[PDB]
Design a protein around this ligand. Structure first.
Ligand SMILES: [Cu+2]
Lengths: 73, 68
């Protein structure tokens, strides 16, 4: 119990505000604790709670858009 | 044919391109994007409210703005 974390190579995100769309859609999935996205290194980092979130649930929240997300911590 | 016009907050080309993959979840849809005008112009036998809800999966200000 306590903070869990993972990295997801969002290979469809890089420009200006695909980046911002992640922080909108992730930040309202109750179990998230801290989101970070890297636009030139083309990846997405997050700290989350294990009672309320999972790496599988992160891959569902990117699938609300159209970005080429693969788990890679 | 039901050519309907919708406008969505395309602050980015990736932020826009997402509309293609969510409309492909419905599949039975025809659509064409204008990145400067911020428009997606659609025709499907599915309802305007199905299309609007599907676009709003992409996390933005989306407004239905009438007919061509
Ligand atoms: Cu972008």
């Amino acid at each position: 119990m306590g903070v869990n974390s993972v990295t997801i190579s969002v290979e469809g995100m890089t420009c200006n505000s695909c980046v911002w769309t992640i922080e909108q859609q992730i930040g309202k999935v109750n179990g998230v604790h801290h989101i970070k996205v890297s636009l030139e290194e083309k990846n997405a980092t997050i700290i989350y709670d294990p009672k309320l979130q999972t790496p599988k649930t992160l891959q569902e929240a990117i699938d609300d858009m159209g970005f080429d997300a693969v788990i890679h911590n | 044919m039901p050519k309907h016009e919708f406008s969505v907050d395309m602050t980015c080309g990736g932020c826009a391109e997402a509309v293609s993959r969510v409309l492909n979840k419905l599949g039975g849809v025809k659509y064409d994007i204008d990145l400067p005008n911020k428009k997606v112009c659609i025709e499907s036998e599915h309802s305007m409210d199905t299309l609007l809800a599907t676009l709003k999966k992409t996390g933005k200000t989306v407004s239905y703005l009438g007919l061509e």
